[PDB]
Amino acid sequence: GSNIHYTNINYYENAASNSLNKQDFTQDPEKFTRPVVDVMKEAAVPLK
Amino acid sequence: GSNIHYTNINYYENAASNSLNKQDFTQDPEKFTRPVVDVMKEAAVPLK
Amino acid sequence: SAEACGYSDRVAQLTLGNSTITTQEAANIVVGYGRWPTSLRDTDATAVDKPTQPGVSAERFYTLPSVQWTNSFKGHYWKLPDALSELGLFGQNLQFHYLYRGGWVIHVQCNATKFHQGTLLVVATPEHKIQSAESPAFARTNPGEQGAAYQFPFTFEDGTALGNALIYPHQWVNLRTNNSATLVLPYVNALPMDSGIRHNNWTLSVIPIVPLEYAAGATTYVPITVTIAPMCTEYNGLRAAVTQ
Amino acid sequence: SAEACGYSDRVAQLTLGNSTITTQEAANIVVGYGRWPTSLRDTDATAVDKPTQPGVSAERFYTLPSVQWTNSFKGHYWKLPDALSELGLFGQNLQFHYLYRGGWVIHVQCNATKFHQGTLLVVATPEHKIQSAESPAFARTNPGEQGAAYQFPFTFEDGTALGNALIYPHQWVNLRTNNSATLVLPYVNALPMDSGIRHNNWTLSVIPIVPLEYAAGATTYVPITVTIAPMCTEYNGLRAAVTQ
Amino acid sequence: GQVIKSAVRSTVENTVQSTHSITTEATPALQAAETGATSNASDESMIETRNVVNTHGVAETSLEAFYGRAGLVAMFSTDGGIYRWYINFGEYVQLRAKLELLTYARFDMEFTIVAQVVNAQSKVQDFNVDYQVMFVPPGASVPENQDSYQWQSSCNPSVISNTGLPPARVSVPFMSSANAYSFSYDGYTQFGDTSGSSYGIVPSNYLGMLVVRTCEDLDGTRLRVRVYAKPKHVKGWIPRSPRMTPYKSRYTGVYTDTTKFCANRARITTA
Amino acid sequence: GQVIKSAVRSTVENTVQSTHSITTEATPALQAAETGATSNASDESMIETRNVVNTHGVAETSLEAFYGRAGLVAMFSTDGGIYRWYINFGEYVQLRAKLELLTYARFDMEFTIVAQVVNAQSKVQDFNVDYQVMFVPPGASVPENQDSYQWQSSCNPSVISNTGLPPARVSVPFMSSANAYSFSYDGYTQFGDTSGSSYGIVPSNYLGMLVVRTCEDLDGTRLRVRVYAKPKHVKGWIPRSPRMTPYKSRYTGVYTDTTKFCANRARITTA
Amino acid sequence: ESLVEINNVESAEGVARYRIPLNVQDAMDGQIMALRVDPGIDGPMQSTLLGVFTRYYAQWSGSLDFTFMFCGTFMTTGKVIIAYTPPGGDQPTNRRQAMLGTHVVWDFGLQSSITLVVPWISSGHFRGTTLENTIYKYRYYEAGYITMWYQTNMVVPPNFPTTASILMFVAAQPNFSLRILKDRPDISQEGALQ
Amino acid sequence: GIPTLYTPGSGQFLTTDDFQTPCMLPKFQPTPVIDIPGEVKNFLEVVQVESLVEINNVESAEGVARYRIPLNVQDAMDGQIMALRVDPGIDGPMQSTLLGVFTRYYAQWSGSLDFTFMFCGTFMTTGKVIIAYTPPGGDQPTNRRQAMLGTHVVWDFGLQSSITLVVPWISSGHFRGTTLENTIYKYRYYEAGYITMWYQTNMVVPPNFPTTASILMFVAAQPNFSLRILKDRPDISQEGALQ
């Protein structure tokens, strides 16, 4: 996988010159998968 | 032989980019040479 | 006294499930790569369903049909788990599940007399390919419980030297010394588990390197018997029974 | 809210092994004699061999062939473990062992519409004998997975009153109220374990007491389906497979 | 106004061992797609699971990993020693389809230029020649000829290289007048005009043109040029439904109607 | 479950001085190969030895030292300006035989590409031309021609270089879906098929293909390409019996039977 | 979740291809549908969100969420069984064989939908996204089948529609991931666009 | 830019070079390393494993028979049983062994060698044999008396079926070339000596017993063994590319 240690010095003035971002994480997808006002717990029925 | 001191900095993001490993040791070969359950000491007869 | 004097006793007893095997002429016990069978670690596993672990119903000794050490005998081999795919509950669990993982305890038997001479190499080879033919026959890659006769022992059926098969877990049955070989084998694969009907992890070979000879008039009919026990097994991906 | 208000919710989910059953019109869940299935205690056991406990490979839901609620329908029954003796690994473990012990989770299904009326008694009877004939036919005492049709429902096939079958664990599928019945059954016998090929501990009966009727023109084809899961099972006395 | 949190993860979710469940209380399997919410039934609730410490990463699907590589955006040959390319990513479909997976996005870009000389029959030549690529922002005068005064490029940025040198390469910042580029625009380019040709294009996405020439005249040959673009430092918003029909035009998303996406099979009951 | 330890060493074993031994107790020389164990008789027990502080290293036989160098894996010439090479190491025997010394192995790889132009008579030309090597994973569309759209390579990784530049070179990680590559597989490629042609090959070892082209058309000449691979960061398991017969096929280990490995001599009693 | 183009047959055009046909039966245990679960192969899954992104990669891993919504009248009842058959053989031929695998029994009611989780059950940590055989022999990676059968029957009142539809949704679970980006095979062109 | 001066070697492709290079898939995350038995870190672990010597490499011996050293009841004393150069990397009986194959992947070697022999006659078959190692200087010993002046072991057939003769590392230099090729390099300089076997007494058997028996010969590297300078194994070759 990715190296825990490696050179990370910027040689140029503008950030546009920098190499690619190295975060690459993901986030809870709820804003897309469950964009609802009322919480609907997994163990209960959705509608009542 | 190998140098006791020398540059060891990774310039790339992925470990696959790194240069060759520099360990190169060997290990006790018993798992291949003597994979037996009962210990058979060098000074004794093997079977009794 | 054996552990005290630093030697291996010639007698042995192997007990698994409802089966017990004994021998009074063993030559120690080999444990492949110095590793006993082990369960799949949570950090190595990938299949998410809770596995089936049959226990004693499958982890016991199964004796296969004997093979005769004939004058022209070139050797015999059995694929694992193929050889036991239709035997007992081990076979049933193997058929009903997509995935299987397990180790083995192998006991090869061949007794003669102090008037006979001969030597068998008993070797358990990981990923042993039967590739002497342009297009390998299924009957030879998966011979089942009957096993298959060797046709190319010198080249180990795979284009390598028979004499170098010693790099794999093995023992010898040298008639003047012992009448049995015992090998404990851990699961080996590049995966946590695999299909028991599409891949054989180990191949047990019994090959005569020193032909069977004897004092004139001695018993000429000398069988070789293989008894194998699955050990530390687990299965995933349950469905209807499927065989290769 | 259900446990707070003191009522039973009409929805239910039953999950065992790799199987999940749901219903949105249940009528609580019955647990026979108020007892969930339990393992054999060391103080009750007699067979000395270490038992086989297959786990999820056998403790899961098996759905049997459906039965039609015909105009002349008198009822249908299935013997346990007989009905599952040839299904999955439960069947294999039952066949390969002399002794078996286990409980059950039964889910009977029958949906119609709010335009249909009818009522089925769903009862699990311990030691239910089919003794209406001088010499009972094996086809009726052990009907297998297909089950057998009732011929004498009023006398419960055993010389007792159908109306008193309520003394046994049961529920009703009254179409205006529910479309399924669920029963959890513990192992019951006068012995710690017994043969699964010679004795049926329970018999599941589905009997129409109020005939199926409906508004003219409604769907007339109404099936009844039974899904059963072995639970907390163990086996002793391993050998080759044997069926009755 | 955000009522739904978005915690970050660096690995996929583990699996925890689960046991049987026989109840009228918990019913994970029952769902209602009408709500607009994706099912929340977990593996552990539908079957009995084992423990799986899953260390699989999520890096290769990040926006940076998905978009962070070069793709062809322009390819042409000079005519009279010059070529004018309007900067837009609709000519070559691969990168185009990728960008349209997002509604809005901010990113810097790395442009790489690969050029070589070809003859009239389009046969490549081993000929080193100096070439100039000049970025002409909207409003600046575009040179008409290979030797026009605009090539002085005292203000317009230019990159001069040689077909004998490695590909030229320069980074560009997020240049839109907007706060993000738009890869879908349901509107018109100007007030007072509702012609179809001015629909679906956001003018702020067009930053100008690249004009290319050989510094001196080639004798009978031409300069072949390929321009590649690589998004960097990507920030994106509002995922979109992927393109499911072939592209037909460079500037519009017009398409040919279809009655199916995947090919047919004999019957729905045979996989 | 490991009952046999594997301590590491950085030098071979020393020799310690020993003296004579006349006893019925210790018998180091007596062995029993039937046990499956290699003799444990030491030099010091078989003869009278002197002290030898042996500083000989063990580095050059480590997996990294043995495998850590480039070897040819592909060599071909374009046809119509293109060539499709299925990534596999069975065509050239040297590296192939090395890899088969292990059953399973994990390693990254460094690929080096050396290319030059040759004419119809296979005579090398001093001609600098740009070439493109595109990695096409299984499932992705493989270009049919030198100018097909797939060369846009917006997602597929590509490396574009020139025969006038040093050899191209890129590293690749351990890419198998498995937890190690397998150099011996006693099984079939799929369920439901037991034909010999689907035996002995583990599909996960095949990661795709490399398709090569010259960016523009060569006039009557072709591109000659050699691909070298160098394993890096090697981890290996289960040593295997070395190949002892010539290879005959690229995808199978089929061989010609033989009655001897080494050549014969007049008699067993004359060395 | 996005819709699976499940009814991909000659007689179904456009929107109709998303509907799984259900009808009042006059026989028991009948089959309703079948599909390979592999998310990246050509077929009903290729045009889904999951399918498109899976087709942008060479390998995948993870459990899959297959959700179904019944769309008949409020008075229309029924029970169906949906099963996942791990690999090894061919798709199950009947309900008895299918129910031996991972499955869920769905009862039509107020809660209109049900989810069948196709758990990640694989020999390796990842699978190839294509099952292309002729060249790579990737049929090696087949993930199995999902089949649906009548558990009881679809039942309706007098004069009601005797046919109804089920919509099929699919999505990746939280343990799903993809590796090795590759060009989506569905996006192509002849000449440069003008 | 920082002023630089590029040097000779620039642009070259040394197959044994060791530089860092850009990765084709910079964000790729490999499958986890799982527990697999038999991990090997150095091939010295392999050459220390005994393998059979193709010792009876004569016209009359084919296949498996080539591993058997013939032994038979004698009617004369002090006779020879076998002979072999001990060099692990030269063409001959050793070339197909594990030790031989790896030695053939290198140019130089050092270390003691383990030669183990297993008797395979009947339990009633007895005998004593002497196995000797003759350090270099002359030709192989012509008779048992000459052979016994060197390093040796006297083996008595019995319950313990095998015996080990350690061929100790006795060399002028710390290493020896693995080939004895003379015409070009004159490497005959490195010859390590000979191993010979002789009847110490005789093979003796009861009435009607097989009067011939076999001995299997094993060889492996000792713990002080090492190899240097990797080279292509001469046994692996091809004409055209394989299809």
Ligand SMILES: CCCCCCCCCCCCCCCCCC(=O)O
């Ligand atoms: C002097 C060197 C020349 C290098 C090229 C500079 C290019 C500057 C323009 C940058 C604009 C890029 C963003 C375009 C995004 C919109 C795409 C579209 O909708 O078609």
Ligand SMILES: CCCCCCCCCCCCCCCCCC(=O)O
């Ligand atoms: C864009 C630059 C191209 C560089 C080459 C990339 C190659 C990617 C494939 C890597 C796979 C290597 C492992 C193969 C090992 C299996 C060998 C075999 O069994 O034949």
Ligand SMILES: [Cl-]
């Ligand atoms: Cl496909």
Ligand SMILES: [Cl-]
């Ligand atoms: Cl297919």
Ligand SMILES: [Cl-]
């Ligand atoms: Cl030689």
Ligand SMILES: [Cl-]
């Ligand atoms: Cl010589």
Ligand SMILES: [K+]
């Ligand atoms: K158990």
Ligand SMILES: [K+]
């Ligand atoms: K268990």
Ligand SMILES: [K+]
């Ligand atoms: K995790």
Ligand SMILES: [K+]
């Ligand atoms: K729910």
Ligand SMILES: [K+]
């Ligand atoms: K979900």
Ligand SMILES: [K+]
């Ligand atoms: K030392």
Ligand SMILES: [K+]
């Ligand atoms: K000893």
Ligand SMILES: [K+]
């Ligand atoms: K040794």
